């Protein structure tokens, strides 16, 4: 049978779902190992052991215990990236769509969503592998992995919390594809993983780190990139963080030993509802838990290591939305709102430069200020609002990436660099907040073909051609099909530096996405707050 | 007779002058103090002695012994600012232009000539005040007063050498024109000072200098503030480069006395030929012997003068020019030619901030650098030749003078801004250099209006309405005529910062003249050094 598989861990039974007025095969929550529950929360994940019998993958697994964001109840808008199943400890599966009839040897892709490292889940409507398996004839896995506390909890120095053990279950996933995807019809040395915001920068590790590098063949990386501000913390922040988490609940703080017995005697919930309270600034755009440089999963500093071109040489593709940013001012900085313009006064620009770089030191905020202010027009608040806007995006996203795929392509073996630009017609969110953040997935995943979802018919085409450049890229190690007579997406050069933007409008071809502010943000700033 | 006047020193007689084919009077090399000479020579000047006879002014007096350019043997473009007339020590002369027939009680207009304080005449052919004088009918006055070492070398403490000594004998000559302008025809009570460059410094400091603001009623600042990076310096430094230039001269050290009259013994040309060994820095725009504050002259800091309105109030007219650095790049940068186009590379761009801004350490000249380089063209020779030229002109002149306005306008009676951008059409320097430093002045003085120096129609009606503006505005305090159906310059407050260009084109009023930069050089830089 097509929905019948047998694997090196047992045997499957998938389900046929309908896509695009055809079907396909899905196999849904096919487990990659052993519940971490119990004594196991915090460890390094552990493989599945093989099962007898067939194992039921008809039905999406459970979400990992996370927070829940509850800014807009019932707002599509913002639940739409809330897990919409059960959340539990136990929930380290993954999913899998096969092209129907079943292929011999086709191209795999794997997702890895994102969400601060601290949400997300891979059941998300936005996260559907049919259309694009179906769409692209490429076998589509989207695995699963423990956010917040539950999976990047560090006590450096212990085996009870060494940290990172959420990409250690990311490359449990990988393991599995790489040695059952064959079985659905895979190809496992054409694997390409891809993944935006914290699974951007999650792919960019699996780059870096040595133990991942020989799991996957192409990348790539959405809305971000391992080196940025947010992604990741010494083992000694690490270790303070787990402190005070402890500290919030009330638990003996002696010892190693001490602490990890406490917190694993609470409920999900409880370390979830202090999770926030650990964080040393006031600030946007940071979180808790987080990756850490711990000289094992990152052998060394990851400057150093972009800079002795020590990471995989292969073929990436990447990019950037045109406002990223706006989502994070939206929540946490004063003077935003939902349902207004929101023009921004001085006072208020100020406290967002404040709480946007949370590290810099008066004089830095001061020369944000500077590089983030048109003075013949201060008290222009759509002035304001955008230059917030732009300044949480280039700090965070934008500038960050731009350092990365410079020093990528440097020993790399080919770079694509995309720019986003166009907002959905049948958005929820206000205008002010722009190409918002995470949007261009829905493209990328193929949303606008089914029409009761509503897109303009520009938006489907939109959507056909990123399709296709993800996928051909996936195949080859270039999005552009070898005697076409489209445009040709221009390969990125230490040179040139050549970009495409990404809408409905005639391709166009740029050069140094925003020079100007990433010189700021990677070559300026740090050297004046070290010097200072 | 008309050509004959008994002041309050002595009877002076003057000789008639033809000016466009018509005439008027003048007294030429009237003396205000007494010959600084011999053991004179760096001391305070003396009144000049009462004289029995007449005194011969028919022709023009000596000029201060001065360093001479050289750059460019016979080109015209720079040696009409080189000394026409023998060079002494004996120089402390002024010239009156007085109209025909002899006013009663007009206003007089007291001109101080710009140089660096190093250099500057008041004989030279763009500073004949007949013109003027004749075309508003106002009474003419071009005082002089000692430049370079001769002028301002400072020794605080002694009473041999106290400094601002330079700026005691402008302060003289305005003493005699306030004691005896009225037997010239000029009303004592309403004199205007006005100046350019180091002279426009200067009117800026007798502005805050208690001992001189109950001498003039109005005043005119052109390219040149008080409160400029190259207009001052502290007893330390000004003590340290007396010593310096000792030392080049092999003098004895051991005390103020011993350096001294080491230095009285030396000829004039000698103390000129190593006068430039003493700067603490390889730069541009800087210069050896200017003002110190010393507590006396200058009762504190300017900027505490300036923040507390200790100050004389009236009402100021001033302005900077389009393009007031490519002087000084010419001469001192590397990559700049009088007969290139000057495209600068990269490597000389950065010498050039080096050379411009010698007190910054590398985190400065890396926040100079990149405010003033479009990351998008950085290897566009001709950006960074305008590049170079903006921060040149931004930290010497604009930005400070912009500073100085701002601060005024919050105690005074009447500010009006303007911005001088017209290329003359018969300039003999190269296109590059545009709107060069100090060449507004033969609009002011009127040169266009005679024919045989080949100006443009528009260029002559130009030279009219500015020379009506600064002279209606010497006599009123408001360069607009009353009930005039022309264009109204508008008011500069603190509020609108309006202020206008000033060329052969329609008037036009802006705003926030170059805050961007302003705000850099002023607010950030400042910062950024003193943490740092």
Redesign the interface.
Same mark, same amino acid.
């Not at 992995?145 to 990311?170: C, I, M, T």
């Not at 694993?264 to 987080?290: A, C, T, Y």
């Not at 995470?438 to 949303?447: A, D, M, N, P």
């Given at each position: 049978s097509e929905l019948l598989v047998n694997t090196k861990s047992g045997k499957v039974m998938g389900t046929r779902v309908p896509v695009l007025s055809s079907h396909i095969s899905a196999f849904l929550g096919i487990p990659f190992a052993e519940p971490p529950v119990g004594n196991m929360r915090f460890r390094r994940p552990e493989p599945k052991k093989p099962w007898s019998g067939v194992w039921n993958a008809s039905t999406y697994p459970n979400n990992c215990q996370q927070y829940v964001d509850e800014q807009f109840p019932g707002f599509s808008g913002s639940e739409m990236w809330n897990p919409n199943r059960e959340m539990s400890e136990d929930c380290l599966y993954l999913n899998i769509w096969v092209p129907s009839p079943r292929p011999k040897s086709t191209t795999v892709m794997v997702w890895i969503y994102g969400g601060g490292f601290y949400s997300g889940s891979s059941t998300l409507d936005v996260y559907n592998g049919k259309y694009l398996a179906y769409t692209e004839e490429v076998v589509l896995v989207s695995l699963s992995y423990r956010v917040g506390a539950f999976g990047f909890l560090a006590l450096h120095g212990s085996q009870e919390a060494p940290g990172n053990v959420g990409l250690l279950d990311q490359r449990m996933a990988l393991q599995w594809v790489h040695d059952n995807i064959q079985f659905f019809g895979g190809d496992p040395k054409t694997v390409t993983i891809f993944g935006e915001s914290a699974g951007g920068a999650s792919v960019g590790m699996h780059i870096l780190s040595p133990g991942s590098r020989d799991l996957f063949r192409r990348a790539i990386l959405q809305s971000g990139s391992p080196n940025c501000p947010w992604a990741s913390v010494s083992v000694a922040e690490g270790r303070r963080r787990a402190v005070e988490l402890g500290r919030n609940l009330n638990c003996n703080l002696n010892s190693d030993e001490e602490l990890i017995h406490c917190l694993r005697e609470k409920k999900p919930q409880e370390l979830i509802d202090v999770e926030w309270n650990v964080l040393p600034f006031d600030s946007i755009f940071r979180f808790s838990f987080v990756p850490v440089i711990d000289g094992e999963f990152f052998p060394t500093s990851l400057e150093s290591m972009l800079n002795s071109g020590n990471f995989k040489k292969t073929q990436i593709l990447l990019g950037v939305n045109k406002d990223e940013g706006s989502f994070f001012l939206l929540y946490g900085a004063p003077g935003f709102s939902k349902d207004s313009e929101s023009k921004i006064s001085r006072e208020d620009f100020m406290s967002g430069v404040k709480l946007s770089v949370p590290h810099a030191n008066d #004089?830095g905020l001061? %020369?944000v200020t #500077?590089q983030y202010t048109?003075?013949?027009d201060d008290n222009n608040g759509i002035k304001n609002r955008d230059g917030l806007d732009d300044i949480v995006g280039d700090h965070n996203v934008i500038c960050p990436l731009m350092h990365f795929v410079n020093k990528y392509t440097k020993f790399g073996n080919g770079t694509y660099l995309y720019f986003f630009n166009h907002r959905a017609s049948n958005l929820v969110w206000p205008e002010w907040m722009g190409v918002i953040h995470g949007y261009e997935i829905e493209f990328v995943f193929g949303l606008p073909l089914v029409k009761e979802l509503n897109y303009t018919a520009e938006e489907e085409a939109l959507s056909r051609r990123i399709m296709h450049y993800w996928a051909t890229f996936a195949k080859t190690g270039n999005p552009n099909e070898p005697h076409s007579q489209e445009s040709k997406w221009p390969l990125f050069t230490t040179k040139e530096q050549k970009f495409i933007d990404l809408n409905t409008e005639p391709m166009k071809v740029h +050069?140094?996405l925003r020079? +100007?502010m990433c010189? =700021?943000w990677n +070559? =300026?700033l740090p050297? #004046?707050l070290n %010097?200072?």
């Amino acid at each position: 049978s097509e929905l019948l598989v047998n694997t090196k861990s047992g045997k499957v039974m998938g389900t046929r779902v309908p896509v695009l007025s055809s079907h396909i095969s899905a196999f849904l929550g096919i487990p990659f190992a052993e519940p971490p529950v119990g004594n196991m929360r915090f460890r390094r994940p552990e493989p599945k052991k093989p099962w007898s019998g067939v194992w039921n993958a008809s039905t999406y697994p459970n979400n990992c215990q996370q927070y829940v964001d509850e800014q807009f109840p019932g707002f599509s808008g913002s639940e739409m990236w809330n897990p919409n199943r059960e959340m539990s400890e136990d929930c380290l599966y993954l999913n899998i769509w096969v092209p129907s009839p079943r292929p011999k040897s086709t191209t795999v892709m794997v997702w890895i969503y994102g969400g601060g490292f601290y949400s997300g889940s891979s059941t998300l409507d936005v996260y559907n592998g049919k259309y694009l398996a179906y769409t692209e004839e490429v076998v589509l896995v989207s695995l699963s992995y423990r956010v917040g506390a539950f999976g990047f909890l560090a006590l450096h120095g212990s085996q009870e919390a060494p940290g990172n053990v959420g990409l250690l279950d990311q490359r449990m996933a990988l393991q599995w594809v790489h040695d059952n995807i064959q079985f659905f019809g895979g190809d496992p040395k054409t694997v390409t993983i891809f993944g935006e915001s914290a699974g951007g920068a999650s792919v960019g590790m699996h780059i870096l780190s040595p133990g991942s590098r020989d799991l996957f063949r192409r990348a790539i990386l959405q809305s971000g990139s391992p080196n940025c501000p947010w992604a990741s913390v010494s083992v000694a922040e690490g270790r303070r963080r787990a402190v005070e988490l402890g500290r919030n609940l009330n638990c003996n703080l002696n010892s190693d030993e001490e602490l990890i017995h406490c917190l694993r005697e609470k409920k999900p919930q409880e370390l979830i509802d202090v999770e926030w309270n650990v964080l040393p600034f006031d600030s946007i755009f940071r979180f808790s838990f987080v990756p850490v440089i711990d000289g094992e999963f990152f052998p060394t500093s990851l400057e150093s290591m972009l800079n002795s071109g020590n990471f995989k040489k292969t073929q990436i593709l990447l990019g950037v939305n045109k406002d990223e940013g706006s989502f994070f001012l939206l929540y946490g900085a004063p003077g935003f709102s939902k349902d207004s313009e929101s023009k921004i006064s001085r006072e208020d620009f100020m406290s967002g430069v404040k709480l946007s770089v949370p590290h810099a030191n008066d #004089l830095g905020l001061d %020369a944000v200020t #500077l590089q983030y202010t048109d003075w013949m027009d201060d008290n222009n608040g759509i002035k304001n609002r955008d230059g917030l806007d732009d300044i949480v995006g280039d700090h965070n996203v934008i500038c960050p990436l731009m350092h990365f795929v410079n020093k990528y392509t440097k020993f790399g073996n080919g770079t694509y660099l995309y720019f986003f630009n166009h907002r959905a017609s049948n958005l929820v969110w206000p205008e002010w907040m722009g190409v918002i953040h995470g949007y261009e997935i829905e493209f990328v995943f193929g949303l606008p073909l089914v029409k009761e979802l509503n897109y303009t018919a520009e938006e489907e085409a939109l959507s056909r051609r990123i399709m296709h450049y993800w996928a051909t890229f996936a195949k080859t190690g270039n999005p552009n099909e070898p005697h076409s007579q489209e445009s040709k997406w221009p390969l990125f050069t230490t040179k040139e530096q050549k970009f495409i933007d990404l809408n409905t409008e005639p391709m166009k071809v740029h +050069q140094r996405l925003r020079v +100007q502010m990433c010189v =700021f943000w990677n +070559q =300026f700033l740090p050297k #004046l707050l070290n %010097a200072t």
